[PDB]
mmCIF file with all atom_site columns, C-alpha atoms in Angstrom:
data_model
loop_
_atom_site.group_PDB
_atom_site.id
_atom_site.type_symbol
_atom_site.label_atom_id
_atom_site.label_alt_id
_atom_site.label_comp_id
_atom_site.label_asym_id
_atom_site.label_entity_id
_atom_site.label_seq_id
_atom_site.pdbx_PDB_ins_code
_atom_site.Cartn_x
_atom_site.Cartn_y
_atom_site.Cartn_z
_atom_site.occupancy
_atom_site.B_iso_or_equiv
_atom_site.pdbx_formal_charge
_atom_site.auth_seq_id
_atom_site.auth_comp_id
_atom_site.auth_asym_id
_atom_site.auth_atom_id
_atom_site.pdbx_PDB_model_num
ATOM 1   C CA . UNK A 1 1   ? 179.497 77.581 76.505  1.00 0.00 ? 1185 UNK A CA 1
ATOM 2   C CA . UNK A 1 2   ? 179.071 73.412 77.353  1.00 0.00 ? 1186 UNK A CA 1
ATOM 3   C CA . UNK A 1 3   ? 176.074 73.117 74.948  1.00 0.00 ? 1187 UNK A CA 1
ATOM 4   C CA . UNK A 1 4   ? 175.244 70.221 76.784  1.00 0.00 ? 1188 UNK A CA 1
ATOM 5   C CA . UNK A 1 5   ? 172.413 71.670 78.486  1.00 0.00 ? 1189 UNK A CA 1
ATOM 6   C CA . UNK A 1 6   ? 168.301 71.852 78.507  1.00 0.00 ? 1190 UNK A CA 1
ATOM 7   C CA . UNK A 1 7   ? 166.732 69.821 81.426  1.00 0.00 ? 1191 UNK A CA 1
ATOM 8   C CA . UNK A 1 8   ? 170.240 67.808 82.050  1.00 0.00 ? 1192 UNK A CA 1
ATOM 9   C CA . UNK A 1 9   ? 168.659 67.474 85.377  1.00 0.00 ? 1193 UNK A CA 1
ATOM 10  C CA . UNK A 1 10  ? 170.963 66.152 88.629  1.00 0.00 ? 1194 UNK A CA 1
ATOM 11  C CA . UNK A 1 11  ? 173.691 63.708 87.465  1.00 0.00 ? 1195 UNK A CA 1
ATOM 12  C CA . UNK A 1 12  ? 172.467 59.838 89.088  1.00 0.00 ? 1196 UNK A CA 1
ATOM 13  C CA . UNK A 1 13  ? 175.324 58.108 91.007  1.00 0.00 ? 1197 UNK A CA 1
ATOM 14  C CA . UNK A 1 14  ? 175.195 54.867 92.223  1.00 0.00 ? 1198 UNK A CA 1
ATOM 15  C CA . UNK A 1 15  ? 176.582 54.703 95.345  1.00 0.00 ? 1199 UNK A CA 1
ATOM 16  C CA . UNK A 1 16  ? 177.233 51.547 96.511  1.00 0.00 ? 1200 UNK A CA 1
ATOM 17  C CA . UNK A 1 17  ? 175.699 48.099 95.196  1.00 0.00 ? 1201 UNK A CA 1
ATOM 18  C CA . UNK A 1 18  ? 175.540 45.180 98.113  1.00 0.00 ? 1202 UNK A CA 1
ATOM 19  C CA . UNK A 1 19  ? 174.046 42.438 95.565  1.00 0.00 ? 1203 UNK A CA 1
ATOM 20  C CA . UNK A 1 20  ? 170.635 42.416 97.401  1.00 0.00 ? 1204 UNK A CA 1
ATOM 21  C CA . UNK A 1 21  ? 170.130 46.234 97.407  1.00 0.00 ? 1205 UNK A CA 1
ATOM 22  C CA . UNK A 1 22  ? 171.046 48.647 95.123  1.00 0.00 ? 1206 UNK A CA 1
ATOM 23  C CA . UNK A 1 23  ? 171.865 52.346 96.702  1.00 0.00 ? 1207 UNK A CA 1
ATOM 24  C CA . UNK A 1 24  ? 171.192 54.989 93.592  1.00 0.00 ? 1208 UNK A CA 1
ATOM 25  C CA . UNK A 1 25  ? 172.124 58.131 94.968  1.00 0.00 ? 1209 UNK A CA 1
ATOM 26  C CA . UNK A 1 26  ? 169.426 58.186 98.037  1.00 0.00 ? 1210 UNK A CA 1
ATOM 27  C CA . UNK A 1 27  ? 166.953 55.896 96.075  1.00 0.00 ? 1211 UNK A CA 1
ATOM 28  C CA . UNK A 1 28  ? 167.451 51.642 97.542  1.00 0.00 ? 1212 UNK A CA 1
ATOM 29  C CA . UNK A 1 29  ? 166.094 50.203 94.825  1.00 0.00 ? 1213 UNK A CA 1
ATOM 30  C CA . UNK A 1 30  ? 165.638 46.385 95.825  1.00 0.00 ? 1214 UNK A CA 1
ATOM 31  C CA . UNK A 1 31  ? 164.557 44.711 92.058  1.00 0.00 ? 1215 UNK A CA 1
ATOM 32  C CA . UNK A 1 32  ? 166.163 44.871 88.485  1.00 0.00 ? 1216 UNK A CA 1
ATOM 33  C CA . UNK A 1 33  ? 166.316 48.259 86.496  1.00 0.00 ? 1217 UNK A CA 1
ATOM 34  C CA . UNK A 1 34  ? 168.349 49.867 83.532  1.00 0.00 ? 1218 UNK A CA 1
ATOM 35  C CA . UNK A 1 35  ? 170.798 52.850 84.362  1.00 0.00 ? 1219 UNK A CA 1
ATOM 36  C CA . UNK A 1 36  ? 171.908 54.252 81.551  1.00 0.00 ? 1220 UNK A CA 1
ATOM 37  C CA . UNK A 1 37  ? 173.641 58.035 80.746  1.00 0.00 ? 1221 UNK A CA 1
ATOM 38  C CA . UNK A 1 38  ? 170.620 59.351 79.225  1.00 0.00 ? 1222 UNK A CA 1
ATOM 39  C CA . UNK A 1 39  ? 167.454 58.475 82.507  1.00 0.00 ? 1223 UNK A CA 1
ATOM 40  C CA . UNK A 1 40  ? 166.849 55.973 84.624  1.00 0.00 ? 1224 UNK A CA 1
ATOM 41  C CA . UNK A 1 41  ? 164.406 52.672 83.289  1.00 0.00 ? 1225 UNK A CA 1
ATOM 42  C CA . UNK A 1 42  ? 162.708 51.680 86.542  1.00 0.00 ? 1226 UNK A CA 1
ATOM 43  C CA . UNK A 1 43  ? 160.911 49.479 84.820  1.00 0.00 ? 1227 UNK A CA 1
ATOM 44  C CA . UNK A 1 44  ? 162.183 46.067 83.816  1.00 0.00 ? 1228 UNK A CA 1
ATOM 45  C CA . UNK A 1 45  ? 159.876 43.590 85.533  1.00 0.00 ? 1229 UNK A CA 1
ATOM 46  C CA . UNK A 1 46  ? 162.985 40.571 85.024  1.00 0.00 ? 1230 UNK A CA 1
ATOM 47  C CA . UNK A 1 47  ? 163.769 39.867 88.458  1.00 0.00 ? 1231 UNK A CA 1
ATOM 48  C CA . UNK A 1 48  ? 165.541 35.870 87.570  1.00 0.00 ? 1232 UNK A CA 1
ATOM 49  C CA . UNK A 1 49  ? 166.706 35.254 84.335  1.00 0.00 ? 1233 UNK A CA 1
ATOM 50  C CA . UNK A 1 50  ? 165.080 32.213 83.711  1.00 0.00 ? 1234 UNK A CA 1
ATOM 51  C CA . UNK A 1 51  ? 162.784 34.838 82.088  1.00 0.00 ? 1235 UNK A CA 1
ATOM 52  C CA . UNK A 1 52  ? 165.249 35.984 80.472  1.00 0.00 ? 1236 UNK A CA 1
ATOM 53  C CA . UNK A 1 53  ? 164.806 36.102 76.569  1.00 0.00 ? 1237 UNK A CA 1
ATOM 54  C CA . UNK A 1 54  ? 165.820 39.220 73.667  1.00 0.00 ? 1238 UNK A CA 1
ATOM 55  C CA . UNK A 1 55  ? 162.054 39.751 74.090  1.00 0.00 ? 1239 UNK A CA 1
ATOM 56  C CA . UNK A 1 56  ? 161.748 41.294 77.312  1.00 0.00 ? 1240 UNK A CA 1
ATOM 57  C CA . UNK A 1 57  ? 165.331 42.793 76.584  1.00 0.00 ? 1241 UNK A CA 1
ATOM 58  C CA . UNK A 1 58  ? 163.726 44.218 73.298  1.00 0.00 ? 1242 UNK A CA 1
ATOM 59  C CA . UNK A 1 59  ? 163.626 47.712 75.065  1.00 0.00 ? 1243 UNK A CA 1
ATOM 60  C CA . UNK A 1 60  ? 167.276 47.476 76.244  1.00 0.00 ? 1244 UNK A CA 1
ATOM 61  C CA . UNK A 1 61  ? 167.972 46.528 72.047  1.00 0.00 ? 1245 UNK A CA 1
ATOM 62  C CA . UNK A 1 62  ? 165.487 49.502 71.441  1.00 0.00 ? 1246 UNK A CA 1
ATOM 63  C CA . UNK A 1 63  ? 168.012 51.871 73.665  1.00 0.00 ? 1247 UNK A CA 1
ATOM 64  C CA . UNK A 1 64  ? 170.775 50.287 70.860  1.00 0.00 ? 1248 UNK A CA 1
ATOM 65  C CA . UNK A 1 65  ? 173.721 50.688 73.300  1.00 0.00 ? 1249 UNK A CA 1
ATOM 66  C CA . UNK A 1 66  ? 177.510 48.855 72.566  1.00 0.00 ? 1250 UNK A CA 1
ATOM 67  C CA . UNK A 1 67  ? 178.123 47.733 75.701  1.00 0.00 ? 1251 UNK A CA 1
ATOM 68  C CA . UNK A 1 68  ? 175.907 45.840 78.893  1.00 0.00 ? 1252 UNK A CA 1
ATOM 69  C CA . UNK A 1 69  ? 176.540 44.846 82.063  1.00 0.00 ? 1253 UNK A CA 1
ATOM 70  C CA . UNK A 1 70  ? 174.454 42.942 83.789  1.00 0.00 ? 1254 UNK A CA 1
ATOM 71  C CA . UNK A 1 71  ? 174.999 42.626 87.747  1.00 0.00 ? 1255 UNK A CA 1
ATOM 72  C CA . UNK A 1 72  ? 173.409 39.224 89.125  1.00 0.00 ? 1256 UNK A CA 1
ATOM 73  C CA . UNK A 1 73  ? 173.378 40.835 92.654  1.00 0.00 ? 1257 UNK A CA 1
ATOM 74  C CA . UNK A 1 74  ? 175.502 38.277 94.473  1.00 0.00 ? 1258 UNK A CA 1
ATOM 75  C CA . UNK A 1 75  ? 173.822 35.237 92.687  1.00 0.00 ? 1259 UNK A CA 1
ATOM 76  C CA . UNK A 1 76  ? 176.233 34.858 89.737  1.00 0.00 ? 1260 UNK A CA 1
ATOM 77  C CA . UNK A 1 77  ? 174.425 32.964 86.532  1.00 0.00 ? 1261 UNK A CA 1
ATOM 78  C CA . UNK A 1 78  ? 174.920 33.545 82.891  1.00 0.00 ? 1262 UNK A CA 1
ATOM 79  C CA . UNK A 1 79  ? 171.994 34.414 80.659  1.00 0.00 ? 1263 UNK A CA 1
ATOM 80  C CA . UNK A 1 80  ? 170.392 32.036 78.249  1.00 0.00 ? 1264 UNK A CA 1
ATOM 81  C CA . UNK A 1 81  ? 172.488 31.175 75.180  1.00 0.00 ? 1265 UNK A CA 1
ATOM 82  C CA . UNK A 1 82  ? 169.351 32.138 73.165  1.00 0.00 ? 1266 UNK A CA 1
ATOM 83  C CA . UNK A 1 83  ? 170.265 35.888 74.307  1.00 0.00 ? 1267 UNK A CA 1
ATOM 84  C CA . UNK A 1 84  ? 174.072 35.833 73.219  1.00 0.00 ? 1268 UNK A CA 1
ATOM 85  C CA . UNK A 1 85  ? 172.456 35.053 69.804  1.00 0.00 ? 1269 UNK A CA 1
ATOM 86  C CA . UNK A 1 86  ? 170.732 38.326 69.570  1.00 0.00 ? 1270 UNK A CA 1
ATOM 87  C CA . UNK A 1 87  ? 174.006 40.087 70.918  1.00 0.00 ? 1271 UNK A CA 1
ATOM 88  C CA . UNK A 1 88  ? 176.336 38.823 68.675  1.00 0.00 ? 1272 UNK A CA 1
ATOM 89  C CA . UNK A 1 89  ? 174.704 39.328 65.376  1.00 0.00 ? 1273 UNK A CA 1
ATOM 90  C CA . UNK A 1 90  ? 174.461 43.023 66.445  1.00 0.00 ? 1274 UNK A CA 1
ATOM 91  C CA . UNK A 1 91  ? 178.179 43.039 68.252  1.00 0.00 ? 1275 UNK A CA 1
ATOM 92  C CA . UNK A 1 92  ? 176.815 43.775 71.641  1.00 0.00 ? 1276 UNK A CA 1
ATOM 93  C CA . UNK A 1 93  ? 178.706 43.104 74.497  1.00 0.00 ? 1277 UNK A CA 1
ATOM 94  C CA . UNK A 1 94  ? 176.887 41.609 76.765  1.00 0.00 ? 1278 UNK A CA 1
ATOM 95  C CA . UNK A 1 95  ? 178.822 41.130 80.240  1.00 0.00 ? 1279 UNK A CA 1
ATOM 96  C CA . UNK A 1 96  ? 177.270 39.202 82.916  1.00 0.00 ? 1280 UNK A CA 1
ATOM 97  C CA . UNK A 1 97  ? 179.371 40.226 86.339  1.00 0.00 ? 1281 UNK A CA 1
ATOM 98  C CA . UNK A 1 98  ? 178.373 40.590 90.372  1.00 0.00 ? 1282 UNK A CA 1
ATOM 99  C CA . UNK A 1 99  ? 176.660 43.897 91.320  1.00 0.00 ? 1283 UNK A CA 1
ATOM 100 C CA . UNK A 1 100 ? 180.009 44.998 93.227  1.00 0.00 ? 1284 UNK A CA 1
ATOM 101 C CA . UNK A 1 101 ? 182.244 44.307 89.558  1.00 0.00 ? 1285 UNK A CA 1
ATOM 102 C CA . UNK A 1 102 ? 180.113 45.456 87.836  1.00 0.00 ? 1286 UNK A CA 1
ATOM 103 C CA . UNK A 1 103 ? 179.763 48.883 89.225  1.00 0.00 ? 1287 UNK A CA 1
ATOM 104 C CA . UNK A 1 104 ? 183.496 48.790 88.762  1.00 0.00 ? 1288 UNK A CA 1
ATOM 105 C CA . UNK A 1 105 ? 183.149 48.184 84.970  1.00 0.00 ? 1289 UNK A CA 1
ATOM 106 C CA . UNK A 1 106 ? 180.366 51.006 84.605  1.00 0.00 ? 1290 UNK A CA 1
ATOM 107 C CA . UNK A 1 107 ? 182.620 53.408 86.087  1.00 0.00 ? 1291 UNK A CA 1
ATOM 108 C CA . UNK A 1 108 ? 185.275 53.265 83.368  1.00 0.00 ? 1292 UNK A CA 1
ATOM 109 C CA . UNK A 1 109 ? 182.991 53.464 81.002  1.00 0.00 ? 1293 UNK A CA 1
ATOM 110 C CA . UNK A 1 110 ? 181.235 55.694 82.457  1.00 0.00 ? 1294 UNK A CA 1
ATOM 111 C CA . UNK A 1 111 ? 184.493 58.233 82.186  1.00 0.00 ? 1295 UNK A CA 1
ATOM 112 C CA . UNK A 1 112 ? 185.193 56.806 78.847  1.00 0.00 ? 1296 UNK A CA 1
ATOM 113 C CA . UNK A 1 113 ? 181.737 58.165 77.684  1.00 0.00 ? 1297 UNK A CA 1
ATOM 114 C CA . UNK A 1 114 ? 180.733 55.333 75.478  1.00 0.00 ? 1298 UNK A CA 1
ATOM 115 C CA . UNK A 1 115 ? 176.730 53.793 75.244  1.00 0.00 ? 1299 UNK A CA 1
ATOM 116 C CA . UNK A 1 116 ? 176.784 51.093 78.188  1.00 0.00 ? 1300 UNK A CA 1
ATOM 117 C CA . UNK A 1 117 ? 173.226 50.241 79.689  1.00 0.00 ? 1301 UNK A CA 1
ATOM 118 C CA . UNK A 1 118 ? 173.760 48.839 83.379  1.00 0.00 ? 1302 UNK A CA 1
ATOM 119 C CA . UNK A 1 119 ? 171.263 46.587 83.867  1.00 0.00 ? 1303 UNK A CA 1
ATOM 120 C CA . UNK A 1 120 ? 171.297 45.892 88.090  1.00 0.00 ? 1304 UNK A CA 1
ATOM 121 C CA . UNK A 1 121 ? 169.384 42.739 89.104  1.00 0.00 ? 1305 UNK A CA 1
ATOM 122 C CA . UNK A 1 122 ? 169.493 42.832 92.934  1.00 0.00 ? 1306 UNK A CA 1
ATOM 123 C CA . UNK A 1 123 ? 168.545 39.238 94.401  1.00 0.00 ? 1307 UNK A CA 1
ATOM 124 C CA . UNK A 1 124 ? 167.150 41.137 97.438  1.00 0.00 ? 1308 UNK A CA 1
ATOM 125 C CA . UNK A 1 125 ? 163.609 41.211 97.115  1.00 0.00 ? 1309 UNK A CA 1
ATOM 126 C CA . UNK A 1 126 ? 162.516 39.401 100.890 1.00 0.00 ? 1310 UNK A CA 1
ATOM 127 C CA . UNK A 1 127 ? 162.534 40.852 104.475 1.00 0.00 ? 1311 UNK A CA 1
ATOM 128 C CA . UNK A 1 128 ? 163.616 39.255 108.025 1.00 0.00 ? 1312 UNK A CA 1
ATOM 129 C CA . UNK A 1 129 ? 164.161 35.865 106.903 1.00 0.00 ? 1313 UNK A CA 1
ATOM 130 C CA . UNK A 1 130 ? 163.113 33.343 109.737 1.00 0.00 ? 1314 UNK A CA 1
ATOM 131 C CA . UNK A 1 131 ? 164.547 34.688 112.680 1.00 0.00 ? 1315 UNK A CA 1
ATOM 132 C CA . UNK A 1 132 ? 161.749 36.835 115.276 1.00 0.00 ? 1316 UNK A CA 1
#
């Protein structure tokens, strides 16, 4: 019998991942959240990483996975140096890719079963823009 089992719930997929929205199964999630093969952290108020610091990624250190992605929705920019720091020391590879590689990445891994937290920042967060 698979003995994996007990509440496993309905497998999340994420569907498709523009850079400004973020389509998780049904759910367009339109901020920055953790997706990771064990639930779904919703909560991660980072939306720019100019905030970005090991403290406010404490609970992503707290998960202890090997592997992260991090999608900068279509606004590519590499975390603070100050953040590799914390990574290194504990061999965690932090990636910093676009939401569309990115989902790329997570797939493999995703198939090769191994701890990798996708953390999705979607730089999508405003409405009609100017135009009436």
């Amino acid at each position: 019998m698979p003995l994996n089992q007990e509440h496993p719930d309905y497998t999340y997929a994420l569907r498709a991942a523009d850079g400004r929205h973020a389509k998780v199964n049904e759910q367009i999630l339109q901020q920055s959240f953790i997706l990771m093969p064990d639930e779904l952290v919703e909560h991660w108020p980072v939306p720019s990483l100019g905030q970005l610091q090991p403290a406010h990624m404490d609970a992503v250190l707290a998960l202890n996975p090997a592997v992260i992605l991090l999608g900068t929705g279509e606004r590519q920019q590499f975390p603070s140096t100050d953040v590799l720091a914390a990574c290194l020391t504990r061999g965690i590879g932090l990636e910093a890719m676009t939401n569309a590689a990115a989902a790329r990445t997570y797939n493999v891994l995703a198939s090769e079963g191994r701890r990798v937290a996708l953390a999705m920042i979607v730089g999508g967060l405003e409405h009609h823009h100017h135009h009436h």
